[PDB]
Each structure stands twice: as structure tokens, then as C-alpha cells.
Amino acid sequence: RSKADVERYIASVQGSTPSPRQKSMKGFYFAKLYYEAKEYDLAKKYICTYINVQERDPKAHRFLGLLYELEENTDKAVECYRRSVELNPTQKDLVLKIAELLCKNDVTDGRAKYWLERAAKLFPGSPAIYKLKEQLLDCGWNKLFD
Amino acid sequence: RTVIIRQHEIVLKVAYPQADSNLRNIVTEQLVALIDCFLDGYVSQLKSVDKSSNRERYDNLEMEYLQKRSDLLSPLLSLGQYLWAASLAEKYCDFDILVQMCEQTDNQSRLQRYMTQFADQNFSDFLFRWYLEQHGQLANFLQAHEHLSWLHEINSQELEKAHATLLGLANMETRYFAKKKTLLGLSKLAALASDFSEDMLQEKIEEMAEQERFLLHQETLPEQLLAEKQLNLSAMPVLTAPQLIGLYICEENRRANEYDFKKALDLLEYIDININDLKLEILCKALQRDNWVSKDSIFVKILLPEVKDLLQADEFVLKANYEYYVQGQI
């Protein structure tokens, strides 16, 4: 594909479903192809509009969080994962991610500690859990040894 | 001032002793210090009545002095028996603040009804003395008389009534925007839930639709200039048409588009000083932002001898658009 393949499909479904609500409900499926065509400032606005009509979809919210992850916007990416997690609790891997990102960016707030506790009980003694325990401590020699 | 000091000295020593005293004895020295305090308060009452009128400043400063003592004799009797309160309250026959808080500490809603039964304006005193400070919600039912009206009105199932006062409190409202907005919403939900005839209802919701129409203006204030002007989101005042018109046009409002001015020309019928000075002020910054498109549109949105001209220039496409603006109006 290219830029033409994806921006030409705009006129494809625009000519099939022209009302604003259905135009915005196709944003996730519009954004589905811009993520593939390496367009992240564009894909961001496409998914963000589908989120404006479909604000309760855990997949869309996570997809934006994964896109904000490529943008390295931790505060924005974390919040997106949070919404997908609070909508659907079965997304364990996202509970790790939130805990993983909260400990890497800043530990001063206890919120990073909380999400790490949950991540532990979802993955009992996994290799990543200790890694996060050491990361949180990082932010002294005797302390690490204990 | 020595006669009196020796009496306020033995009140306090009659207070230290009942702390350690066989029951009956601690009462007889209490009926005594009540016998004595009722002769002091009677002599400050008789000297008051002796002096009046001019030099009043000295006569309203001696009132505060006897009134800070029937309060210091009351507190003292707050631990003691309240069976004597009725006689201390009658001796200095008002000192109501003390007998009114003795009736509050107990379940004698019968005493505070017996107090107001024999009184001169205690009712206007027991309500203002409840607000300054269960069955307290039955006295809240009566104290909710005044602006707290709407509350006891929803409770009494007096909806139509709740609507009238809820709108009235919405109007006087100037201190908080978020609150003026809440009151109308409530007023409206009151009126809708009430039993107006479909005609009356249609009037309440139309005269209302107006209010919501003006408000909506301050409501749609852009989020660029409200962080620029460093404004509180909700904790801001009920702004007036002028402030709005002038704020919708500020050089702070950067992305100002057709709709910001159109609404800054819709808030002119919301006035009650110079109308056509502003009519110009705004059409002129409507061009500064143009950077000689928007003037274009706002003349497209109006559908005209409102705008000025020679007065305006007070220039190649201003007259040029003012020609296909004489064809448009015609």
C-alpha cells in the first residue's frame, strides 16, 4: 500500500455511509490502515474520532495507547491503557504495561506502586515482576541487596 | 465595681465547690448563686431603663457589658441544673441565647415551643439563631423558609412553587456561573415535573429557553483564551454581555472565527451605554484578523444599514466588498 491506497479509500466509504456518526464510526477502521502506512499523526486523529463516538471500546482505546507508546507520550499512553483496562478487566497484559510504564517514568507517586502490586498478583513471580520491583527501587547499595 | 466584683468572685467559688459536694448541698448553693445573680442582672436592667437617648454610645456599650455577663452566667449554668435556667431566662427576661441552647441540648421541642408561645418576636429569633449555629429537621423545615425555600418545597410536593423561587435565585445569581447554571436546570426540572397546564408549561420553558440562550454564550467561551486569561473553569462569575462581547474579541482569543464574532453581535440585545460604538469596535478587529475571508462570512451569516462606513475608515476591498454588499442586501 501507499498514501494513495489509504486516502483513496476515504472516498470509498464516504460514498457508502455519509452521515457524521457512521463517518466517525469508521475512524478505527480508517486508522487501522494508517498505522500500516506509517502515518502516526494522521492515524492518531482517525482513531481519536472513532473514540469520540465509540468511547466504550477497549480495543480502540488500547490501540491509541499503543500508538501513543510509539509516540513515547507516557502520560497519554498510560491513560489510554487505563480506559481499556477499566472497561475490560480480562486484559491482564495491559495491567503489566501500566505497571511497567508507571515505574519507568516516575516512582514518586504511589500510583506506580499500586499498579505494580496488581501486576504481581496477575503474573505470580514472573520474570518481569522482579524487573519492575528493581526499577521502582532504582529512583542505596544495602537497599538493593535486601 | 467592688460590690459587683465580690459577687462575680463568689459565683466562681460557688462553682469550684460543687465540683466536690454531696448532691443536695451543691443545689442549695446553686439556688443561692441564682438568687444572687438575679439581683445583679436586675440592677443593671434598672440602670439601663434609667438612662436613654443622647449619649447613647455609652448606653449601647453598657449593654454589651451586661450581655457578655448574662452569657458568662449562662455558660456557668450550662453544667448546672437547667431547671433554674427557666428562672434565669425570665429574670433577665430575654437572655434567650442561653435558654434557647438549653432547649436544643435536650429533647424539649416542647420547651422551645413553650418559649415561642410566650414571646415577642422569638420566632424571628429562633430561626436566625438556628442558622447562625431529626426533630432538628422539623425546625429545618421551618428554617428552610428563605432561599432554602425550594428545598422544603420539593419536600412538600410544591413543585410549581419550587420552580418560581429556583428561577428567582437563578436571576440574582452573579457570584458563580456554575451555580447560576445549576439553578436554572433545577428550576426547569422542577417545572417540568410539576403540574402546569400544557400552556403554562410551554411558557415557563420558553421564557426559560431565553435564559439558557444568553448563558450558552459565556458557556461556549474558547479554551484558548480561558487559560490565556488564566481564568478559573467554573469558579468564575456570571459575566455580562459587554464583558463577553469584549472577551470574545480580545487579541487573546487567537483562533477567533466567524462564530466568535457572530455571537459577539448576538450579545448586543443583552445590554440595557454606546451601542454603535461597539458595533464598530468589533467589525474592525474583524478585519485586523483578516490580514488584508471572515468579514466575508459574517456578512453571509447575518441573513444591513447596521454597519457603518465613512465612520469606519475613521481600503481597496472594503469598498469592494461593500458593493457586492449593496447587491446582496438588495
Binding site: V13, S16, T17, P18, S19, P20, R21, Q22, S24, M25, K26, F28, Y29, K32, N52, V53, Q54, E55, R56, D57, K59, R83, E86, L87, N88, P89, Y114 | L148, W150, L151, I154, N155, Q157, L159, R175, Y176, K179, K181, T182, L183, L184, G185, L186, K188, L189, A190, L192, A193, A209, E212
Partner: protein
Amino acid sequence: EDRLKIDVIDWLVFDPAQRAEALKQGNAIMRKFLASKKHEAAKEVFVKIPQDSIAEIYLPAEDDNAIREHLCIRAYLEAHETFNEWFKHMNSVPQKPALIPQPTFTEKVAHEHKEKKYEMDFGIWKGHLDALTADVKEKMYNVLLFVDGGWMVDVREDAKEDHERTHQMVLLRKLCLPMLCFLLHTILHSTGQYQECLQLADMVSSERHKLYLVFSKEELRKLLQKLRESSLMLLDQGLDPLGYEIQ
């Protein structure tokens, strides 16, 4: 007959060339169950709909609405999944330490600890609560303030007559919007967010949503005796009825 209907879905899902008809029919089926409040019924159907249905289908007036309706329905379900969790939690508050009047010096210390541990759990049960309150609230405002035309309200207006569906969409609004409001009020009141409780009278009366039309006159008053209750607690705190400082 429940199974007959929830089973006709797997038949339509099997053939990807009928995903537009599978969704549409899935909607209808879930519209009957919602009117009965069978949320485990509605959701058991909701999972049978492949998670990637919307993407592939990409528009007749009948497909634009059914895509919108489906998300509306998900917005509704998620507004009950998060409340029942929140509600389950509100009913699991750490219990006070039991008192042993006339304690031995042994029982005195076991109790100094049980009393100090409880004063750790009650802090987290407000911790977990706040995060389950922040989440259940969001969902209740996604449904009540549904983006682009209100909940269960078609955006597309050129479909062919379907009185069954259309009147099913008006009803679902009158059964579930009064019921979601009263819940949110119960959530706001339960967490002591009284100022915001009263701001349900802005949301509802709003001309932007016209939520008040979905209310019966009785339901209104009921909401007005619910708000007067939040107001009280705001007076007990020393503020005015609506939560603003008394200057």
C-alpha cells in the same frame, strides 16, 4: 426460546459474507434482552460477534445505524459491568476490630495490632473504591452523554421503515436512561460527591441532550428528592445547597 435466538447468531457469524446481517440481527436480539435487563444474555450474544466485525464490514442506512447501535449497546453493558464490580466492593468494607471489654494484657496487644491493621485496609478500600468510582462514572457519562446524537439514537436518517426497531430504541431509552441516572446519583452520593450529584440537573434538563423527555413526571420528582438528599449532606458540611462556600 432464549437459546433459539442466541443460537441463530453463530449461524450468521459463520459466514463472513453475512456479517452485516449478523450484527443487525445481533442488535435486534440484544434489544429484546435489554428490555428485560438480561445482561448476561445480551453479553453472551455480544461476544459471539467477532471483535473485528466492525473493521471488515466497511454504507447503507441500515449498516451505519447497526454499527452505532452495537457500540451504544457496548457502552450500556460496560456501564453495568463496572457498576456491579464497584457495587460488590462497596459491600466488602473492612470491619472494625472486635472489642474485648475487660481485656487481658495479651488481648490488649493483639488488639492494638488488629486496630492498626484495620486502619490500613480502610484506607485502601477507599483507594480501590476511588479507582472503581472514577471508572464506573466515566462509563455512565459515555452512555448518558453518548457522542453524536444521544444513546440509541440513529444518526443516519435515510433507512427504510422499521417501526419495531425504532420504537424499541425509544423504549430502551426510557427504561435505561432513568435507570442509569439514578445509579450515577447513587454512586456520587455513596462516595460523597454531593456537588456533582446536583449537577445531574444540568445534564438532564440540558437542551443539548434533552434527557428530560425520556423521563416520566414521576421519575423526575424522584430525581428531585434524590438531589435534595445530596444537598442536605452539603449543608451538614457548612456549604450552600449546591456546594458553594457561604460567603
